[PDB]
Design an enzyme around this catalytic site. Structure first.
Site, PDB file in Angstrom:
ATOM      1  N   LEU A 135      40.698  36.303  32.211  1.00 13.25           N
ATOM      2  CA  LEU A 135      39.327  36.253  31.715  1.00 13.25           C
ATOM      3  C   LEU A 135      39.318  36.166  30.193  1.00 13.25           C
ATOM      4  O   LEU A 135      40.372  36.209  29.558  1.00 13.25           O
ATOM      5  CB  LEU A 135      38.536  37.472  32.191  1.00 13.25           C
ATOM      6  CG  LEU A 135      38.427  37.649  33.708  1.00 13.25           C
ATOM      7  CD1 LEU A 135      37.616  38.887  34.052  1.00 13.25           C
ATOM      8  CD2 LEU A 135      37.823  36.416  34.355  1.00 13.25           C
ATOM      9  N   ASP A 158      33.275  54.204  34.922  1.00 19.84           N
ATOM     10  CA  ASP A 158      33.692  53.929  33.550  1.00 19.84           C
ATOM     11  C   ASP A 158      33.156  52.587  33.067  1.00 19.84           C
ATOM     12  O   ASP A 158      33.922  51.676  32.753  1.00 19.84           O
ATOM     13  CB  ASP A 158      35.221  53.958  33.435  1.00 19.84           C
ATOM     14  CG  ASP A 158      35.702  53.904  31.995  1.00 19.84           C
ATOM     15  OD1 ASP A 158      34.934  54.302  31.093  1.00 19.84           O
ATOM     16  OD2 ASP A 158      36.850  53.465  31.767  1.00 19.84           O
ATOM     17  N   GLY A 165      47.224  50.763  27.726  1.00 23.68           N
ATOM     18  CA  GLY A 165      46.499  51.967  28.082  1.00 23.68           C
ATOM     19  C   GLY A 165      47.381  53.004  28.751  1.00 23.68           C
ATOM     20  O   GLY A 165      48.572  52.775  28.970  1.00 23.68           O
ATOM     21  N   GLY A 186      49.313  51.943  31.666  1.00 21.34           N
ATOM     22  CA  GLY A 186      50.431  51.068  31.381  1.00 21.34           C
ATOM     23  C   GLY A 186      50.100  49.946  30.417  1.00 21.34           C
ATOM     24  O   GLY A 186      49.542  50.184  29.348  1.00 21.34           O
TER      25      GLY A 186
HETATM   26  C1  LIG Z   1      41.196  44.306  27.424  1.00 18.38           C
HETATM   27  C2  LIG Z   1      41.379  44.732  28.882  1.00 18.38           C
HETATM   28  C3  LIG Z   1      40.560  45.959  29.307  1.00 18.38           C
HETATM   29  O1  LIG Z   1      39.840  46.525  28.486  1.00 18.38           O
HETATM   30  N1  LIG Z   1      40.676  46.377  30.587  1.00 18.38           N
HETATM   31  C4  LIG Z   1      41.466  45.744  31.459  1.00 18.38           C
HETATM   32  C5  LIG Z   1      42.646  46.347  31.875  1.00 18.38           C
HETATM   33  C6  LIG Z   1      43.469  45.708  32.794  1.00 18.38           C
HETATM   34  C7  LIG Z   1      43.113  44.469  33.313  1.00 18.38           C
HETATM   35  C8  LIG Z   1      41.931  43.861  32.908  1.00 18.38           C
HETATM   36  C9  LIG Z   1      41.583  42.620  33.439  1.00 18.38           C
HETATM   37  O2  LIG Z   1      41.214  42.508  34.608  1.00 18.38           O
HETATM   38  C10 LIG Z   1      41.714  41.548  32.648  1.00 18.38           C
HETATM   39  S1  LIG Z   1      42.005  41.530  31.026  1.00 18.38           S
HETATM   40  C11 LIG Z   1      42.017  39.884  30.886  1.00 18.38           C
HETATM   41  N2  LIG Z   1      42.212  39.122  29.798  1.00 18.38           N
HETATM   42  C12 LIG Z   1      42.085  39.584  28.543  1.00 18.38           C
HETATM   43  C13 LIG Z   1      42.750  40.719  28.087  1.00 18.38           C
HETATM   44  C14 LIG Z   1      42.601  41.158  26.779  1.00 18.38           C
HETATM   45  C15 LIG Z   1      41.800  40.445  25.898  1.00 18.38           C
HETATM   46  N3  LIG Z   1      41.671  40.875  24.636  1.00 18.38           N
HETATM   47  C16 LIG Z   1      41.477  42.320  24.373  1.00 18.38           C
HETATM   48  C17 LIG Z   1      40.620  42.556  23.140  1.00 18.38           C
HETATM   49  N4  LIG Z   1      41.091  41.754  22.003  1.00 18.38           N
HETATM   50  C18 LIG Z   1      40.277  42.073  20.822  1.00 18.38           C
HETATM   51  C19 LIG Z   1      40.915  40.332  22.335  1.00 18.38           C
HETATM   52  C20 LIG Z   1      41.779  39.918  23.513  1.00 18.38           C
HETATM   53  C21 LIG Z   1      41.146  39.299  26.334  1.00 18.38           C
HETATM   54  C22 LIG Z   1      41.295  38.869  27.648  1.00 18.38           C
HETATM   55  N5  LIG Z   1      41.803  39.368  32.101  1.00 18.38           N
HETATM   56  C23 LIG Z   1      41.633  40.284  33.076  1.00 18.38           C
HETATM   57  N6  LIG Z   1      41.411  39.895  34.329  1.00 18.38           N
HETATM   58  C24 LIG Z   1      41.105  44.513  32.000  1.00 18.38           C
END
Ligand SMILES: CCC(=O)Nc1cccc(C(=O)c2sc(Nc3ccc(N4CCN(C)CC4)cc3)nc2N)c1
Length: 342
Positions: A108, A154, A35, A38
């Site tokens: 997550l 958001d 994003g 970053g």
């Molecule tokens: C996808 C992340 C998002 O939309 N926002 C975001 C940005 C930065 C950090 C987090 C965040 O707290 C996350 S993101 C994450 N794990 C995670 C990250 C990405 C994904 N995917 C993103 C979508 N793909 C289609 C499947 C895999 C699945 C799990 N764990 C945490 N704790 C979420």
């Protein structure tokens, strides 16, 4: 030629590499997020012996400052004692690495948009939607804590991630857009599909915007399609009016941007500007949810807990969440006492 001794690229952020080992603790796996702020990566903590998601902020002053604000917020939430904290994503620790800011979050699972795309955009059962709704209302109830007063600003299906792929537990992520209650500084906030009308009308706002977003989300979780999916703000407002009707005159009389969508007739009444759309309020949510027609598209006919009564509870709650007046809009505490959650 090279930036930050060849560690960064054109966009000031770290070039992640499979199997790279940081500080003899974290072990980088693969890029999972990207994003403006970053990048987000999957990694293995060797000290805690667990999987974590690390947020690498770009190598610039602005992004670093914003990220620091966000970190302060997360730490502020983590310091409160209530169990309601367990619907907000947990910032385990944070540090600096090669001129980058790194935020360590719990790993997550899927976000809700992924699930929706897994249903072929048909939505999920009302029984699951009730659980999601309950947990979300609990989280918003937590953020409304007087000492916190935090507005997510958001809320969208991709900012709500599952803890476990086999349980109905969710959590809210990305508090980079976040805001503690205060005087107005920003006006182009929230995602377009989930932007409250008071924002669309250029009016003061509080936590009540989040609730609005939530209302747009839950329905989308059952139908599979966005409730209001305008290509622009005009189309968006037209699509909101198309369902809930033209806003109260006392609201539009206050709205500075009211004339971006409406015009005031000689008799004082407000009317839509022509630019396509159904007459105001004739796209009934009752018919959208399919209360008396066996669910959305009739794909929920005969299923457990999908009676008319359930759909009516649900509809009542949703209509309480999509109230045009931020002052009269339903609050989390009372939302958790709705007949829907019995
Ligand atoms: C996808 C992340 C998002 O939309 N926002 C975001 C940005 C930065 C950090 C987090 C965040 O707290 C996350 S993101 C994450 N794990 C995670 C990250 C990405 C994904 N995917 C993103 C979508 N793909 C289609 C499947 C895999 C699945 C799990 N764990 C945490 N704790 C979420």
């Amino acid at each position: 030629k090279v930036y930050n001794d060849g560690y960064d690229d054109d966009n000031y952020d770290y070039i992640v590499k499979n199997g790279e080992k940081w500080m003899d603790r974290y072990e980088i796996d693969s890029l999972i997020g990207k994003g403006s702020f970053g990048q987000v990566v999957k990694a293995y903590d060797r000290v805690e012996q667990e999987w974590v998601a690390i947020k690498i902020i770009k190598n610039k002053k602005a992004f670093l400052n914003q990220a620091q604000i966000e970190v302060r917020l997360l730490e502020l939430m983590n310091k409160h004692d209530t169990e309601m904290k367990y619907y907000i994503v947990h910032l385990k620790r944070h540090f600096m690495f090669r001129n980058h800011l790194c935020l360590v979050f719990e790993m997550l699972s899927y976000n809700l948009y992924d699930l929706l795309r897994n249903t072929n955009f048909r939505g999920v059962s009302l029984n699951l939607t009730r659980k999601f709704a309950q947990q979300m209302c609990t989280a918003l109830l937590f953020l409304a804590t007087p000492e916190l007063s935090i507005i997510h600003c958001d809320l969208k299906p991709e900012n709500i991630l599952l803890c476990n792929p086999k349980r109905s537990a969710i959590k809210i992520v990305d508090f980079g857009s976040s805001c503690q209650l205060g005087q107005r500084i920003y006006q182009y906030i929230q995602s377009r599909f989930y932007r409250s009308p008071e924002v669309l009308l250029g009016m003061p706002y509080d936590l009540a915007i989040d609730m609005w977003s939530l209302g747009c989300i839950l329905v989308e979780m059952h139908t599979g399609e966005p409730l209001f999916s305008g290509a622009n703000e005009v189309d968006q407002m037209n699509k909101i009016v198309e369902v809930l009707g033209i806003p109260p005159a006392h609201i539009l009389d206050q709205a500075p941007k009211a004339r971006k969508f409406f015009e005031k007739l000689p008799d004082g009444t407000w009317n839509l500007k022509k630019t396509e759309y159904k007459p105001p309020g004739t796209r009934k949510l009752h018919n959208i949810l399919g209360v008396e027609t066996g669910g959305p598209g009739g794909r929920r006919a005969g299923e457990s807990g999908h009676t008319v009564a359930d759909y009516l509870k649900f509809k009542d709650l949703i209509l309480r969440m999509l109230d045009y007046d931020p002052k009269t809009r339903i609050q989390p505490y009372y939302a958790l006492q709705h007949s829907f959650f019995k």
